[PDB]
Amino acid sequence: ANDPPNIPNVTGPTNGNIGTTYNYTFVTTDPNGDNITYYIEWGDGFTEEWIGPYASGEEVIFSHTWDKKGTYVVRAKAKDILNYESSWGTLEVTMPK
Numbered sequence: 001a002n003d004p005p006n007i008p009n010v011t012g013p014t015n016g017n018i019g020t021t022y023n024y025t026f027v028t029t030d031p032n033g034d035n036i037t038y039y040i041e042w043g044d045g046f047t048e049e050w051i052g053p054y055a056s057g058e059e060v061i062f063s064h065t066w067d068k069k070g071t072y073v074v075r076a077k078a079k080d081i082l083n084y085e086s087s088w089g090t091l092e093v094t095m096p097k
């Protein structure tokens, strides 16, 4: 009967300056209204590993700083209390200088 969460959405700055801190907004819903945890990749090797639980539909804002030039693929997936996992939402963030 249980369904996995929907794929998370990630919004925030897609270009910035190396060393400056930026805020990213994450949110998804679970079809059953279940609480969920998020697994975030910042694209640079750092992660947030199943943070939460949070309410279904609650926007959660986390900041990050990249300290090397590059193009970083920020990704987020979610799983409900029964550990049924979503696919990944993604946002590409460029740090040119």
Ligand SMILES: [Ca+2]
Binding pocket: 002, 003, 004, 005, 030, 031, 032, 033, 034, 080, 084
């Ligand atoms: Ca569910």
